[PDB]
């Protein structure tokens, strides 16, 4: 009823496991934290920040309306915020 | 004598590593103010 890999229960009660992972887990957590806290996530994914959904006196959605100029359209909307 | 690195190890960490990273990012998000 086993296929050769080490039992999980034996691994996560072991000391060596927690010597590695008490580091690797908080590191990965802090990394994701910084991904957001630095603002990088906004830039990578193109997600608007709370101050950049609309231009100040605009209440229209910057909706893409063209297939092959779509890219240029998004870029045009963003410049109307800069 | 068990092997350390296995197909299983890869499957496990393929899911586990981004999960903790995403959890960290989502935790930071709870302090964003408008």
């Amino acid at each position: 009823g086993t296929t050769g890999e080490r039992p999980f229960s034996d691994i996560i009660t072991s000391v060596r496991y927690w010597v590695i992972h008490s580091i690797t887990i908080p590191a990965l957590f802090i990394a994701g934290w910084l991904f957001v806290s630095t603002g990088l996530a906004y830039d990578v994914f193109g997600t608007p920040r709370p101050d950049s959904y609309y231009a100040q006196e605009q209440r229209s959605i910057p909706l893409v309306t063209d297939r092959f100029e779509a890219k240029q359209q998004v870029e045009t909307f963003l410049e109307q915020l800069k | 004598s068990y092997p350390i690195f296995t197909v299983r190890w890869v499957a496990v960490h393929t899911l586990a590593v981004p999960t903790i990273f995403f959890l960290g990012a989502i935790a930071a998000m709870q302090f964003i103010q408008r």
Binding site: I20, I23, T24, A27, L28, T38, L40 | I4
Partner: peptide, 28 residues
């Protein structure tokens, strides 16, 4: 930019520390 290095540092350090602690048994 610099925010990429900030994000990637904990990951590289944790990967380093795991390598250090596991290297002898991975050779076996």
């Amino acid at each position: 930019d610099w925010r990429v290095l900030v994000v990637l540092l904990p990951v590289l350090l944790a990967a380093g520390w795991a390598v250090r602690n596991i290297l002898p048994y991975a050779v076996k």
